[model samples]
Target: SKAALSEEELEKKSKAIIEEYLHLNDMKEAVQCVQELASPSLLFIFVRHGVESTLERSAIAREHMGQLLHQLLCAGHLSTAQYYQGLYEILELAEDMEIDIPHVWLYLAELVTPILQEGGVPMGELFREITKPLRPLGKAASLLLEILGLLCKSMGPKKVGTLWREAGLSWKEFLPEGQDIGAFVAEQKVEYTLALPSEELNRQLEKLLKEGSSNQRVFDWIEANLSEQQIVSNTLVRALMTAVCYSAIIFETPLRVDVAVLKARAKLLQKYLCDEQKELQALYALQALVVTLEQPPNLLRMFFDALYDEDVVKEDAFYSWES
Candidate 1:
């Protein structure tokens, strides 16, 4: 009986069924009709048409809408995904145009949760992007923090810390006093230990420098002895500089060192540079060594070479290699 109908008639019937089921909020029947139609265009139209109304109806409708979207995504239906993607973009455009939608945050949550669970994009970046547009909504700050808390709980503290840093969120801004987020992050911190004894470290350093080891090999030696919490003591800095000076003299090449290790030391120097006596002491000690080198260019080159690609050094005028 259906085969007897014209192509136009079949299309008309399909469209009618899709609209009728969506109007009745019957997502199950609607999804069935969509699959029967086997047309992405129809799926897009019906999904987009249903989403706004479905979200407005009730909590159960919202849940059904999410399930329907998930079904489409799992079935590899591109059109439904594209429709929601476009809906998100339109919502953003409406915000920019000063159009207000009631319960916009809920709508965004419904759309984003499935996408996040599907792992199509990085959760931190996507969550931040979604939150940016929602910032303008009323009572949205608390809701955003709640969502962040939930994400933190689900993703664990290490991931949350990385997300926190990546999202550029300050502790005081998103977290209130007495919040356990700081403690959670602190618990995830890994304490580094020296792989060798202090005597062994010094002996290895001296051996490496005497044998004309490469800068990388020397850095590897240093990293073995260096604990993450180790302060930039005068002894450590002098030993590092001694290795650099010796390498330059022995190799007869411009001094080169691991940029990462140099950057770590630079951070420590910057930390100590804040104190009056310590700053003066560190500067004088480094200056004394700089003066001892026959070619100041090599000494400058060693420090400056590691700094070329660093944005912090470029942005901060106080981080001069000469100092």
Candidate 2:
């Protein structure tokens, strides 16, 4: 039926159907219309057109792309093999998309995440495919590598290497050989946290807390994002101290206010802050102490005590806040 058309005619109609689908966002029509189409390879063509429409523009379309891909697969229009084929196909063009939209890799990563959630696809192939667009000269390098690293983070290297050994391939080119995923992900967190501007200290810190970020990352983020300025003044550490205090308490999700957690954080907060210049941090920690106090089965005194035991806060560091 629909297969009877000339190649040019079929592809032309397929592209038209997708353009209309994006506007209508009618998942029902997409599945029905694709059923009429003759080629399975046409599945990827729809994927190509869908992502191309998102170029530096409609995030709505990007949003819909994920929805539509799920629908097609659920309705049996695109098999898993075909779905992954489409994913790899577009990544080959990621350099082009990254130029059009600087964060295309980020968008693509988000889009692919859902599918990867269902798992069972050969991650080695996904790795090889995402890695294809990388080059010595390109805008895509730094931002684009995140997709693979995130793969390692979410799936673990053992899972990511699921098919690589059978295929006689190496996962090491993009990752350190046999490195732990925890270390891999924290390194990214460190690098990403380091790049954020100091003014965003609280917003970024809030995210780190809410997301199950490691203490390692939070300390590293705190180390990187603090600005040396008059934040300490309004009689010195007051405003900076206040912002750090208010953010943790007011936010619905703050770091777990336990002594083990606090002291772990406390140890770094004091060391790094003192390095930069923790009278500032030591005082700012009053916020942590306050929250630690709020907990019913408390460790508040132990926390305050460990400020001494762990050498996190010297005793007079407590009494010495500006008069």
Candidate 3:
């Protein structure tokens, strides 16, 4: 027995069925049905319909459903609208996290470029916020090197280098051996000048010079967060090289010395040389000192002796032929 009806009547009956479900007094049945229809497309339609229904009926239940849908969208369980929605949620939660989530910042940077292209808000303000967590940590040496890896992949090498300089972080401070020989020697020429009579001036100059000698700030930041292996990474090695070079220019013992600054810088340099990486920079560091002090043979012998004692070089390349 065919229960025949007109096309319009069929449509009307279908609409009535949907309406009955929406008007359900039993929350359990409604929740179960919502879960059943919660795929990406279905969830999107549910959210849209829920919003429209809430606007039409102005009911708290419909509004609540819409809110839940938005949260699901933000959580990115919903696949289609997930990118934009997830970014919105992450930006909202960034500063609130008890453990700083660098991934959130990374994700934010990843999503932002495309969003900007699609004509969203200007990104400068958002970029500032993304970089905020990264700033307090040293960007000159190790941190800067790690950051450069990310930036180079995303923005290219030139831009990465420029960004680091603009950020006021340089690798030269971390690794001292990479200092240019001619430039370093030339720069130290000015160290002989600026005679000081006052003890206060001497103290001030000593503090300033010693502060320039070590990448204490960078090391302290890393010692707090990074593991031993991470500290030995090429990124950190390059940074250390840069830092050492910077220190040579700034501190270079002859200028002045504060006892506290001297102790701190000496400790920093000792640690840097403690687990010296087997790299060309280690050789360059030895070479830099030779050039800086004008290639004095006795000084060279003494320097090599100290490095050998510390096992910085197991068998000196230069001493191999002489012996």
Over the stretch 156-254, how does candidate 1's per-residue lDDT look in tens digits? 333355555655655344344566655634552311000445435445665775675665665565567677644356555544544433333322233
lDDT of each: 0.48, 0.53, 0.40
The superposed Cα distance between candidate 3 and the true structure at residue 182, in angstroms, equals: 15
lDDT of 3 at 118: 22
Q: Which candidate do you rate higher for lDDT, 2 or 3?
A: 2
Q: Point out where model 1 deviates above 4 Å.
A: 1-32, 79-81, 93-102, 118-323
lDDT of 3 by residue, 1-323 (tens): 23334333433432343355556644345444445444443343343333333333433444344334434434444443433333333334444441554443333333233332223322333344334333443221222233333434443343334444445543344325666634542453311111322323223333444466245564565586457776665445434433443333322322221234323444444555444343344556445544544343444455455445544444644444243
Best by TM-score: 2
What TM-score, to 2 decimals, does candidate 2 have? 0.43
- Between 1 and 2, whose lDDT is larger? 2
Per-residue lDDT over 290-317 for candidate 2, one digit per residue giving the tens place of the 0 to 100 score = 5432442333444456555666556566
| lDDT measured at residue 316 in model 2 versus the true structure, 0 to 100 | 66
Q: Point out the higher-scoring one by lDDT: 1 or 3.
A: 1
User: Which residue pairs clash in candidate 2?
Assistant: 232-236, 232-237, 233-236
Which candidate achieves the best lDDT against the true structure?
2
